[PDB]
Amino acid sequence: VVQLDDFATRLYQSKHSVLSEICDSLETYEYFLKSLIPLFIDVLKEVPVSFVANSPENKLRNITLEILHRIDALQAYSNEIVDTLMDLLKVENELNGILCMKAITTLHKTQEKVHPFIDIVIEIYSNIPQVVEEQFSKQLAQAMFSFKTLAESPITMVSLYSSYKELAASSLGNNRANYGEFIIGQVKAASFLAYLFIRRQAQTFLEPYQQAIPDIIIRLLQDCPSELSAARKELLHATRHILSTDFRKMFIPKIDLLFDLRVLIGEGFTAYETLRPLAYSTVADFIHNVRDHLTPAQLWKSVSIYCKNLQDDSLALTVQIMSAKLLLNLIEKIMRSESKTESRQLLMVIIDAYTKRFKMLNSRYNGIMMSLQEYLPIQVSVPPEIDLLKDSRYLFKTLMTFLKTIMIGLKNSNPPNWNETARGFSNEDINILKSLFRECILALRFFTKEEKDLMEIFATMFIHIDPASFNEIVREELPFMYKQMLDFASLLHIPQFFLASVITSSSFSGILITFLKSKLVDLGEVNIIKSNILIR
């Protein structure tokens, strides 16, 4: 066509004349493709090696990538791509092998050369150990992705485990910029371990002759330099996928001992921003899924670090409710331990940790009726677009649901009709119940069957708890509840249920009738809404 007339006339100067004509023709068929394939064989013949130059050899790769960017078509192309990837492969040659592997990925998307390329990748991985001893590798990252893509595209039954033995024999041991470039090759190994992660947990098993498989991961979370943030994001997603299948999860209660899976892995501030809601969710479900092999030193270290995310208003919202649901489903190991009072002294930390989240919910209510950080110039992320009123109703609805199941587990943890309704509370422990009654009353200001449903969940938590120590909580919080009951008449349902045919009717009605005899003199003088409530 017209692209062949402009290029045959244009067949540093003529390389710029050919590449600009090819880029314009690509901006603009098969006969021009086969003619350019003959021109590509002449272009690849002259100076196939690079030695990283500022000369037309890089422009020769630019016109070759221009042929790759445009589109025996595939047979002569794959023979030329394997020939260019033959010379200068397992050394620091150029980035032309990345364009060659991308062209090989485009050719394989449409068979014996793939077995030769996998053999070329295995020897380059074998020669990677000698190159690592030389510095005692960017093509290894490109060959890791391309090989996996080709395997997914076609068939991989016997040669997949054959290269996996070469992948089992891959790199496992170990100036500042050259050490970081060697760490960039180690960063390529983490992307290469993602190919080891995707094969090990997708569908089926493989050659299971491997026992140091957790040792090649817990090491690599530690010595991974925190410069490249996406290198650790895929390495966290490497462990996110491996800790989902059951046969690989049991390897982790070995020499890790669930002890090196804390937040000394999220080092840099560039990883401190958004990699923490990922680095917390992989360890929240993993701790829930095991629920075994846990010494109570670990059970304290897991119940401490996962309520210092609940009381942290810098993470997110939906990762605060994930960190609350963990402590709910962790009660089946904490309650079912021995009655050494460690089943009670652990459950009161969690009830404290839900008390100190209802407190922060009540600070922002009058602010709805340091919250201005959007006027700050250098915004560091996408600003949140969610409102405050709907999700605070959503958080309080969910946290009251989780709270009743913990307080049922308080009923069984009684110290020596014992262990049924009666329990001994210390004075250090009744002070955190009085701030649970005070904040649950106060967080119903965010208001009717929807809020009257929570008043069932709030009162039923306080029925089954020790009516010698229930006459103390409701006595101190009755002058406080009457003050909230003036501006909100819906809170009148709470004392209505506390005496509605229950085990507290014989004691709450005597406490209430002592209270209202004091306000009997102050009935003739108040206005309507205080006198309406008082006769109710």
Binding site: S229, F269, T270, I378, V380
Partner: protein, 342 residues
């Protein structure tokens, strides 16, 4: 941003603080010195900042880079755009360039030939949350059409019609497609669910903003293969059909075929079609005779109690009562039964 009149000797070594923090190693406090140097350049050598702001970056600094360019561009023309054009020869790294040829386009209409190739790349990016950015790029093609003002512009509208056919924001894009057509389509409507009805909705919109009579004969074959959303599409179709009737024998056959479709309904869509038919045509009393029998069964079901259909049938009975003025006895009896109802 707040005190430019503080001093000027401290302005000399802002660069001794800010440009020193360009050479960091992370990806967030390295970028944060690109933004604090963009407030200082935008007050009063500035080539090396904005040639590296649009360079190849990862998807980590999406909101971080975009705020550093938008505060830099009004002083850039004060101090040309070959470096934005040079990076087009080398996808995901285009959207940073695209958003600075999106907002401050008072000077962007200089070399719009690459903008047409970017419009060709816009459809390639259209093939996700970036579809809203692609619709912004589709609005940018209307903006570049509003900035520059060929045959590729009609081809760009064809890709934009196919983008609307691939599908809110598209309704605003279809309104932008209607404004672009005013400033193969029948074969595209013959080739093509609800988007095909939306494609038929845009076809009548392109027909508005004789030859319309023979096209209505082709559209009568199109309406025969078609006759809620179909009622809404036919309501726009009858407005295009009655506009040509407002100014021959082909219009009598299309009225008889819809009356046969009204006989096929006798369900509520035919009453909606008859209301659009009686909206701009005088004589429909022959179909209104069996329609009064259908509305009598509709009023019997309405009196026994589809509130929108009964209100439309009451509007159909309101239109039929004005047309009837010999079933006036049965119509007034059902009206009194409706008056006696709740």
């Amino acid at each position: 941003k707040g005190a430019p009149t503080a001093l000027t000797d401290m302005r000399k070594d802002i660069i001794k603080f800010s440009w020193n923090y360009i050479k960091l190693d992370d990806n967030t406090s390295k970028q944060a010195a690109y933004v604090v140097t963009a407030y200082f350049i935008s007050r009063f050598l500035t080539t090396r900042i904005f040639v590296a702001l649009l360079r190849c970056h990862q998807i980590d600094t999406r909101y971080l880079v975009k705020q550093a360019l938008e505060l830099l561009a009004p002083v850039l023309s004060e101090r040309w755009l070959k470096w934005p054009r040079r990076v087009l020869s080398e996808t995901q790294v285009a959207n940073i360039y695209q958003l600075i040829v999106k907002f401050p386009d008072l000077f962007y209409p200089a070399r719009d030939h690459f903008i047409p190739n970017i419009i060709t790349a816009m459809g390639k990016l259209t093939v996700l949350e970036n579809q809203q950015l692609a619709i912004d790029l589709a609005e940018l093609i209307l903006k570049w059409e509003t900035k520059l003002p060929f045959a590729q512009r009609e081809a760009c509208v064809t890709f934009l019609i196919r983008y609307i056919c691939i599908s809110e924001l598209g309704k605003r894009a279809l309104n932008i497609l209607y404004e672009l057509l005013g400033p193969v389509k029948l074969q595209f409507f013959e080739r093509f669910l609800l988007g095909y009805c939306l494609n038929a909705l845009e076809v009548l919109a392109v027909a508005l903003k004789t030859w319309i009579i023979e096209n209505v004969s082709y559209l009568q074959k199109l309406l025969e293969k078609c006759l809620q959303d179909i009622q809404e599409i036919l309501q726009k179709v009858l407005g295009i059909i009655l506009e040509a009737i407002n100014k021959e024998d082909e219009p009598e056959e299309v009225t008889n075929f819809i009356s046969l479709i009204v006989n096929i309904i006798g369900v509520a869509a035919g009453v909606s079609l008859c209301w659009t038919l009686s909206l701009y045509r005088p004589n429909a009393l022959d179909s209104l005779l069996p329609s009064i029998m259908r509305t009598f069964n509709k009023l019997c079901r309405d009196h026994i109690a589809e509130f929108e259909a009964k209100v439309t049938t009451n509007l159909l009975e309101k239109i039929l009562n004005l047309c009837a003025a010999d079933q006036r006895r049965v119509f007034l009896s059902l009206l009194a039964q409706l008056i006696d109802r709740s």
